[PDB]
Design a protein around this nucleic acid. Structure first.
Lengths: 701, 191
DNA sequence: TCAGCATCTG
DNA sequence: CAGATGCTGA
């Protein structure tokens, strides 16, 4: 019985308040987030009630299915994906039970008028911290507001640090979810602190020192990083807030801030800036790998490739060839190792001595080691069975109970939790991780009459991991204190939209303005505001693909035959606007070799064509509503031969024209090398000669 | 053969056309691109400074030509209000909106509108060359793209010999030889 | 744009 | 050494 249906005493008070009145539950970094969802799913796991899932992950769905099968539920929850036909979904939604659908198919199924509505009890919203932005999750909640009674929405989240963001209020996210009340259960609560006080393990913190050579190496690395930061700030005073000092560069939210501040990459294009960015990234990854891995792989696997990359060209920059030479002396002389392995061996020998001295009428404990990645785990497993000097010699000559399991990786945490629950340990070694500490605390609090488990700590003097764990805790505390203070301070129109045009942000913003949406299947056009107008939207990338293949002309010639005024809309970007002009060909060509050149011919051949431009998706949403001031509402019910063919495809030719041209000239090179005077003299029309001169004489850029 | 109105005296777009001759005449539209193709130059700064400038011109223009092409150049850092008004005016009236970013772009638009009286064969130059060269064999989209990115013009392709076309990998020498044999072979008999 | 076939490349 | 996708025919 892995799945536990009953909850703790401090968790029964919330279910009594969330069942009556709906509200948002914010956990303390996974403070029973999945435990409440699994309990709420069992209460609605009946064929009569229909409860749909908003958005989940495939790694947790299989675990939930296995847990519900172990519990012995009469009806197992199904999963609807893009693996069957659209007609087959009519039998799955009508059977009942929990259905794990996707975030993209649920909108199409709801807007295609094929979902058995008027009988759904509700929809459980999971991971509500991602609805801050105008994503596809808001459209599902907006379209769900169609039930008069028995309509409820439960939103669950466990990321309290995501709400502490500028230009992002909590009221804007609360109003987009149709939720009135709001609940909170932080770590500073009394009911949570009083229950977890009587069940706390004994944690032992051990400070590990470092070698003097490693200290000098870190000092030199920090000096080089500060010099690079000063050189970057001297030649770039614009992005000053992104890099205030050298302490922010060592932190984690540095690359994201750099990529956010340096948005115009095509405007600030520079070799020195890119070289300095690459040098900063190299100094960061080297300082990371020096503390994460051993020193032999830092010199043989990292310091060897960088020298070859610098000697091959300007990949790593030439400024690292005549600077920081002492780093080449300390790395080559290191031989020694890191005190972390010595401390681990001492801890292991102490645990062994304690188990041997207390082996009388007492069972020993299965000590396990936790690693950050798989490489560190493999290194720790190979160093124990072989040794220190033996492994150091093997790695140098190659290129020239007691179970270890990684923590971070692609593996789901459910597997690690099952592994930890399979065998009960007595001494656990952690890497100063908050998630593992919370898991160990929950495990110790779940079993009251259990054995006293001891958690060891490994924090180096002035290391990056300790600073990161402190900054994360400080940010979490600040976000919680801000959320607590914010909580304690409180004639219609229709538009026909194509089914294949639901992935864009336009339908998500059209329904928000107040106008209704009446979608139906179609074949031509994407947006129909009135029966006399049809609009098709094309992005800055799809327009080129539609103009190069030729489907745009076929779609335009098929729409103007029945409708009155078929128009189109072009969506571009104001940050990086394409000039649609060749710099190196505007002087050697007669204004050709451009997408706009073909667009001009397309809009000239069709006189009933309008070209619209919008820089942001928020502009077209208002333009579509402004065009319906006095227009009526549309209805949903009304919705030898070789050279011959080579010359025929040439622009500015015809039947008689080609017949007269082929009777005079013989080859194509003679008319290609000749000027347009003879061509306009033998024909008369200068337009065809100008077209031929523009086509056969152009430049590429 | 374009005719420029005397009102556009200090216009930098007129100093960018070199492949099309222009003249002056007492014509109502500012730019006459042949027949039934009238162009009108207007900047966003002049529209923001004088809002009652394009409406009067559009009302006095009337319905004389078959197709009206109204080009506008954007110069404001926030083209959210003027662009919507221009689009609404172009939708209400009978004209085509053309977005420009520089006077050179407007000159290129004019030169393109001037010399595109050809047949509707469009069923960028890469698309045009891959649609006009696909009628003969040994030419596909990839081969056309390679010939455009390696030569840049049809003159350098028709001037090279058979040995000069067998050095590009990805298409083989036999395909280039067959293409040259189909190209340089005449269709009409000697008479 | 739909059935056979061979160049250079993996 | 051996199989990949545009030439050939309409």
């Amino acid at each position: 019985r892995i799945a536990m249906a009953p909850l703790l005493e401090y968790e029964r008070q919330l279910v009594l308040e969330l069942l009556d009145t709906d509200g948002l539950v914010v956990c303390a970094r996974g403070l029973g987030a999945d435990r409440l969802l699994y309990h709420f799913l069992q209460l609605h796991c009946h064929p009569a009630c229909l409860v749909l899932v908003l958005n989940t992950q495939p790694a947790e769905e299989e675990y939930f299915i296995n847990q519900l099968k172990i519990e012995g539920v009469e009806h197992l929850p199904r999963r609807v994906t893009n693996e069957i036909t659209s007609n087959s979904r009519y039998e799955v939604y009508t059977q009942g039970g929990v259905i794990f659908a996707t975030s993209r198919i649920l909108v199409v199924d709801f807007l295609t008028d094929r979902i058995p509505s008027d009988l759904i009890t509700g929809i459980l919203v999971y991971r509500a911290h991602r609805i801050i932005e105008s994503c596809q999750e808001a459209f599902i909640l907006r379209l769900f507001r169609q039930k008069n009674k028995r309509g409820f929405i439960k939103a669950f989240t466990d990321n309290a640090v995501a709400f502490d963001t500028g230009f992002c209020h909590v009221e804007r996210v609360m109003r987009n979810l149709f939720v009135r009340k709001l609940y909170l259960w932080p770590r500073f609560h009394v009911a949570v602190n009083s229950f977890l006080e009587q069940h706390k393990p004994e944690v032992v913190e051990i400070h590990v020192s470092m070698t003097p050579t490693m200290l000098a190496i870190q000092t030199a690395i920090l000096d080089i990083l500060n010099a690079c930061l000063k050189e970057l700030k001297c030649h770039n005073p614009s992005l000053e807030v992104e890099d205030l000092s050298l302490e922010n560069a060592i932190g984690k939210p540095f690359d994201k801030t750099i990529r956010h501040y340096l948005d115009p990459l095509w405007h600030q294009l520079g070799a020195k800036t890119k070289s300095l960015v690459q040098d900063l990234k190299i100094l960061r990854t080297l300082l990371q790998y020096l503390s994460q891995y051993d020193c032999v792989t830092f010199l043989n696997l990292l310091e060897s490739l960088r020298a070859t990359e610098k000697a091959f060209g300007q990949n790593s920059g030439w400024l690292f060839l005549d600077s920081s030479t002492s780093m080449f002396i300390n790395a080559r002389a290191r031989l020694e190792s890191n005190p972390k392995w010595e401390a681990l061996t001492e801890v292991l020998k102490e645990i062994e001595a304690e188990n041997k001295e207390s082996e009388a009428l007492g069972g020993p404990g299965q000590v396990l080691i936790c690693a950050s990645d798989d490489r560190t785990c493999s290194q720790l497993r190979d160093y124990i069975t072989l040794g220190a000097e033996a492994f150091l010699l093997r790695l140098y000559r190659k290129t020239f109970l007691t179970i270890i399991h990684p923590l971070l990786g692609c593996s789901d945490p459910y597997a690690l939790t099952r592994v930890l629950h399979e065998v009960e340990p007595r001494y656990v070694v952690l890497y100063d991780a908050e998630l593992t500490f919370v898991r160990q605390l929950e495990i110790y609090r779940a079993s009251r009459p259990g054995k006293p488990l001891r958690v060891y700590f490994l924090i180096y003097g002035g290391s990056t991991e300790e600073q990161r764990y402190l900054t994360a805790l400080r940010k979490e505390k600040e976000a919680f204190e801000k959320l607590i203070r914010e909580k304690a301070s409180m004639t219609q129109q229709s538009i026909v939209v194509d089914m294949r045009e639901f992935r864009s942000e336009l339908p998500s913003l059209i329904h928000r303005r107040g106008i209704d949406i009446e979608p139906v299947t179609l074949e031509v056009g994407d947006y129909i505001l009135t029966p006399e107008m049809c609009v098709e939207r094309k992005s800055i990338s799809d327009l080129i693909g539609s103009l190069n293949n030729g489907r745009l002309y076929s779609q335009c010639i098929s729409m103007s035959r029945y409708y009155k005024r078929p128009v189109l809309l072009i969506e571009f970007d104001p940050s990086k606007p394409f000039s649609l002009t060749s710099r190196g060909a505007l002087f050697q060509e007669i204004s050709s070799n451009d997408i706009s050149s073909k667009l001009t011919l397309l809009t000239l051949h069709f006189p009933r064509l309008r070209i619209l431009w919008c820089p942001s998706p928020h502009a077209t949403a208002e333009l579509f509503e402004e065009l319906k001031q006095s227009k009526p509402q549309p209805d949903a019910a009304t919705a030898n031969p070789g050279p011959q063919d080579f010359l025929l495809k040439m622009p500015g030719v015809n039947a008689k024209n080609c017949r007269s041209l082929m009777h005079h000239v013989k080859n194509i090179a003679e008319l290609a090398a000749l000027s347009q005077d003879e061509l306009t003299s033998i024909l008369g029309n200068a337009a065809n000669a100008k077209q031929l001169y523009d086509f056969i004489h152009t430049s590429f850029a | 053969s374009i005719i420029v109105s005397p009102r556009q005296r200090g216009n930098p777009v007129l100093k960018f056309v070199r492949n099309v001759p222009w003249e002056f005449g007492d014509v109502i539209p500012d730019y006459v691109l042949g027949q039934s193709t009238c162009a009108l130059f207007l900047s966003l700064r002049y529209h923001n400074l004088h809002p009652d400038y394009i409406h009067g011109r559009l009302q006095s223009l009337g319905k004389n030509f078959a197709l009206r092409v109204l080009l506008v150049q954007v110069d404001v850092k926030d083209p959210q209000q003027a662009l919507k008004e221009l689009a609404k005016m172009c939708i209400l009236a009978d004209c085509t909106l053309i977005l420009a970013w520089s006077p050179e772009e407007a000159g290129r638009y004019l030169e393109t509108y001037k010399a595109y009286e050809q047949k509707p064969a469009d069923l960028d130059f890469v698309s045009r060359v891959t649609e006009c060269l696909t009628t003969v064999k040994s030419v596909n989209k990839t081969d056309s793209q390679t010939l455009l990115t390696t030569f840049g013009s049809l003159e350098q392709l028709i001037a090279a010999s058979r040995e000069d076309l067998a050095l590009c990998p990805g298409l083989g020498p036999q395909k280039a030889r067959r293409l040259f044999d189909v190209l340089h072979e005449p269709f009409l008999k000697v008479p």
